Amino acid sequence: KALSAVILAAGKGTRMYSDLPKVLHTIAGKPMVKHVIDTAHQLGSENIHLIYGHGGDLMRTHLANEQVNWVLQTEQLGTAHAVQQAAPFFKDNENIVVLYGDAPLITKETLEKLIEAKPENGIALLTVNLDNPTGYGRIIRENGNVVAIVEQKDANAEQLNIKEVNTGVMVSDGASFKKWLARVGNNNAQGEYYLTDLIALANQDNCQVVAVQATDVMEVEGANNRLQLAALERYFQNKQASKLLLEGVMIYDPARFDLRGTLEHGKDVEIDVNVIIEGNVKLGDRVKIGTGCVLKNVVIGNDVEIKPYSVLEDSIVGEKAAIGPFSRLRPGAELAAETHVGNFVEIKKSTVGKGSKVNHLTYVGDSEIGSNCNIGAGVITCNYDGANKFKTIIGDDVFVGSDTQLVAPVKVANGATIGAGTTITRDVGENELVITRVAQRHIQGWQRPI
Amino acid sequence: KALSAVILAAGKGTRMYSDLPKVLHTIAGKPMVKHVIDTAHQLGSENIHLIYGHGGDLMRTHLANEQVNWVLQTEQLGTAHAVQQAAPFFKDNENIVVLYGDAPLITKETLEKLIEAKPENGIALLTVNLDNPTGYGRIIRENGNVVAIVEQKDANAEQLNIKEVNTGVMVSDGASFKKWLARVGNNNAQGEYYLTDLIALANQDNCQVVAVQATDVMEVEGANNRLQLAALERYFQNKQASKLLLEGVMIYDPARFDLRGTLEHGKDVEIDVNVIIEGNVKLGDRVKIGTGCVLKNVVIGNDVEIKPYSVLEDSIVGEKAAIGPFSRLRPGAELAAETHVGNFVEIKKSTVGKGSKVNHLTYVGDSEIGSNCNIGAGVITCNYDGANKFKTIIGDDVFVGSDTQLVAPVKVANGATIGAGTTITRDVGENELVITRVAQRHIQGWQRPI
Amino acid sequence: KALSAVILAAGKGTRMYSDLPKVLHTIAGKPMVKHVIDTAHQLGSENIHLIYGHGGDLMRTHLANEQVNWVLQTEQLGTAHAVQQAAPFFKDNENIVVLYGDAPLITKETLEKLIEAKPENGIALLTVNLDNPTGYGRIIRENGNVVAIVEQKDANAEQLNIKEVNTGVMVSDGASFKKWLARVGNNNAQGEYYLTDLIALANQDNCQVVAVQATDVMEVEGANNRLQLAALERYFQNKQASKLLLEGVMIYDPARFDLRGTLEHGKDVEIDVNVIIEGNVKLGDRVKIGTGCVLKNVVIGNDVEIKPYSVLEDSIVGEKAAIGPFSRLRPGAELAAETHVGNFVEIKKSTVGKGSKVNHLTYVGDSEIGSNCNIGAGVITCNYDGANKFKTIIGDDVFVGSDTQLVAPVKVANGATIGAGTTITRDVGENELVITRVAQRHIQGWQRPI
């Protein structure tokens, strides 16, 4: 049976004290509403109807490439009225699941179990058990089937002791939503059309409402301020970390590990404390990552060690390379197998060939470096004033002496040797040795002012 | 009604295993006793009488500028005897609050609620409820009014089940303190004059003692060793972090955030994990701070991004600047709007003008740099031997080529261009181009020893 | 009475998803089984019989220098059969303690209390109380003496409410082990010879079995996957940190501190958040360590401050030195008293004399530097192509100007001054001043392309 989803995303989020609307704030680097859209897509939703309102232009800007139907709410008349704006697009046959863009951790696993429990022409309601259910609408069963949701203020002494509560998440067929939504009224203290009233309208219509319990309460929690958002963040990180650990990734402290994206991993991977993994990252077998490292959108080959406080982005690193500590790889850095990148070294948009070393106090930008080169301490690739970032091409088996400037555009051919302190502006031929002739003045018996 | 405070601060803190006296150990970068002095000043105390003893010269050295009356205790005869040394300075009218320099987290809010509850000519006692009250003196009420404090060893079976206990914190008028303190005896196992006996002396005198409960038990806890100090530290940091989060600061993980001072903030500020904020820090709107950064005594303008592992002190950073990763700003660094400071760059005591960039492997010290300058990789400002840190003045629209040394004192005027590898010792005029003439020796067919 | 131990270490650890066998995975940088071997050695064990099996060559490789008897298990027939392979080496007199290589946190203190409780010709059994004992074998007493261990599936309604359970850890004399192990059968669902059956065989033989309770449940827990290993890691780190705090080390956040080795410390030591201490480390009095530092196998003298994000290995640092931030000390770095090492500085295998400073953007390798030298920003020690890391010797009171290359092998004698931008290839004599003669071309009125 086909499926579609409706996601409520119109709220201002006043208590975030932000210019962003509520659902654009991120969990693990991704907006809360994108978590729900992605979950709804994993379930196999055919359409996703996004009820939006506050921060409308920002929603459109930030979610421009999402495959959703953009349903604009111009006034807050409650959850039933919100869903009814999407109702004309519901297929009579096809289940509709209702979700909330500010409760982002709802799992596919829980939702497909909710969808399974839905009786034909009925409703499946997601519920949760709280130790202190004060403030939340209680589930009343008769027997095993939900007959009513009794709000805090209406509940008698014994109903107040019901620990099972309403989450707001609900599944029913499209024909049934169209029917019941048109019957919902707003005769209550707030004057709003409540989606909760579909439970009453279903029973009044002799239709079955079945309750399904959530696995974790955190998966129905919403974030109304940054403190609550931070609690959803730590729960989500802990759960990502636990999954990786059971898969065999040795994360030394899972409370000091952050994944903000996707991680593919080999076996015997070791990750020390305070590491941040962003975007799409792939790690081969026996990769070791030291403390403080940040990896964003990188592929790391088998048997690579990354030493402490290295920052890597949009880069490729071949097997058996050694990086760090204090290394920086900027976008376009491609390191071949068995390369060495050391402390206080920045590599931007450059390819470095097999076995080559760049171990100290060096900037290599917009370059090609061949295999088994030795790039000395203090070497800098640079440009003329008014230039447009031109290229430095270094061949195989080249020795570049310490504190040499390579002035692009320039080529240094295979087997060349460049002495320390050189300024290289002209192409260097194959097996050419280039030494700087210094002039010095020596003064004997110069007493220092000490 | 006027107020003054008495703070007990004489203890050795043997179990800290330190040369510092007990109350000088810090919480959030500030001595425990300074927390209490500051709280007492926030309440509006007119005098603060500081009972000190052990580590007397160190207390005087470290707290030299505090507006306190220095009351020296030469011998431990108990809390009543300690307070009585300050008593001659109590005004008959004026409330006196008693506090402890080794219980630093007592809040102004709790204390002004304690002061309000004090009945005329009576005592207001701060109490707290413990789940396991074993060891602590129990509050006995009759009815709603405190009649006695029964110590662990004296309490019958049912009194042992009283969960409400004495904190030691107390408010009464000065006339009443002088009267009752002179009546306190020391006929007990320890032979000391106990402040607790004022509860008995008050009732024996037909005066009312009213109990007021503390909000959090942590706010009456004392630190007798570093393990307890560390627990007070984490409670205090968590509470600072929660406050900032409810104010709209996005702190990605509040368990990995430290504030040791004061933070002023705009809206939409984002702070990643493992950041330390020290002294007085001001952050404009939409400032983003990456992982591992340390900010001490800095002003950061609107829309600044600070990238990972940057350390900044006594500096100003203008709007839309970009700093990091791996940047170091030392005291006197002033960066104008739209500036760029990159990896492995140290700026000390220098002004850098609007739009200028200093992006790699560079030391700029004691300099002025104008607007829209390009300071190349490897550039170093330096001095002659025996010099006294003289100044390097760079004008507007200057290009300084990579790996150039600027030897102070020297001026480089507007629009000058300096080629790579240059040593600049003489002033450079407006629109002057300065290129280094290299001499090189080329040897063809030189076979490397490989 | 003499002692020996038997350690069960043969398991594959399938659920680690590793090429390492189970007990080689580390806690605090040391294999789980080495924790137990070391504990067994601290107890005074005369022999340690190591039952090994899966990953046999790796065990032999990684534990090659351990003083253990290598007892190879070729087939899993249960714990009684495993111990019986070591039994021929038990002395009739001498206690044998049985331990598990995958439960590493068992303390010497608990084990010597277990050994004390052993009645002559009897058994001492280590037990623990669980709140939920489901799955674990219950201890049945009659009275005060263990009569049976009833497994989950065999226990009646009231036995299921026994919270005291079997740990597997056991002490009995060698003669008694030989006797009872030969009597153990395998008529059970799994078909294995169970060590638990010695409790029954002991009583059936009219011998006394006495129960001793473990202090902490974590000290009998085993790690069957990396998630459980990570929980043992955090418990162990917390406990190491608490011990240091009670000894007077100020650890600002004990949840962000890691010790992977041994730490010797003076008094008034301060350690900020996210510090990692590895191998054998010694810290004098009043050492301050800033955030993010990594110290491996180092001696740090009195009154040293290490500033944030410094990485130090196999190094010595004399009293009153200042290191960091962003400093790197590689193996063989020896810094004398009152030295200064600053940001983006790497020191490898070099001695630096009293009062000398190396404060920016510098590599010093394979060198000797004397006392009161000033090593300028950008200075690099380097080698000729084809050389074998030769030495740079700098005497006392030498000034080396910024961005100078020192080309080894070379000597610079006492009191020499070297100007900025110099390439030093020949020895420099006592009180010799060496200045580089630059040739520059100046072009007036050069308009930059802007």
Ligand SMILES: COc1cc2c(Nc3ccc(NC(=O)c4ccccc4)cc3)nc(Cc3ccccc3)nc2cc1O
């Ligand atoms: C952000 O966009 C919206 C979110 C809404 C929203 N978000 C939401 C819904 C449910 C929960 N979760 C719980 O209610 C819950 C949490 C913990 C335990 C048990 C339940 C959290 C956030 N709730 C309601 C209206 C609404 C209010 C209450 C229940 C359902 C729907 N209306 C909303 C309207 C919006 O435009």
Ligand SMILES: COc1cc2c(Nc3ccc(NC(=O)c4ccccc4)cc3)nc(Cc3ccccc3)nc2cc1O
């Ligand atoms: C450091 O200077 C002093 C501190 C003292 C000191 N500190 C203190 C007082 C109270 C508490 N808090 C609690 O007693 C408490 C903690 C948790 C729950 C409930 C209560 C902690 C530290 N207490 C007492 C004497 C003293 C002893 C006990 C109670 C009051 C006063 N005498 C002190 C004398 C000093 O010179």
Ligand SMILES: COc1cc2c(Nc3ccc(NC(=O)c4ccccc4)cc3)nc(Cc3ccccc3)nc2cc1O
């Ligand atoms: C890794 O090498 C081995 C470990 C074993 C091993 N490890 C072990 C033993 C005891 C515990 N601790 C507990 O049983 C426990 C934990 C928490 C609370 C209470 C108890 C953990 C790991 N246990 C057993 C067999 C075995 C199984 C169960 C009990 C004892 C022995 N056979 C083992 C055989 C091996 O070759």
Ligand SMILES: [Mg+2]
């Ligand atoms: Mg240089």
Ligand SMILES: [Mg+2]
């Ligand atoms: Mg140079």
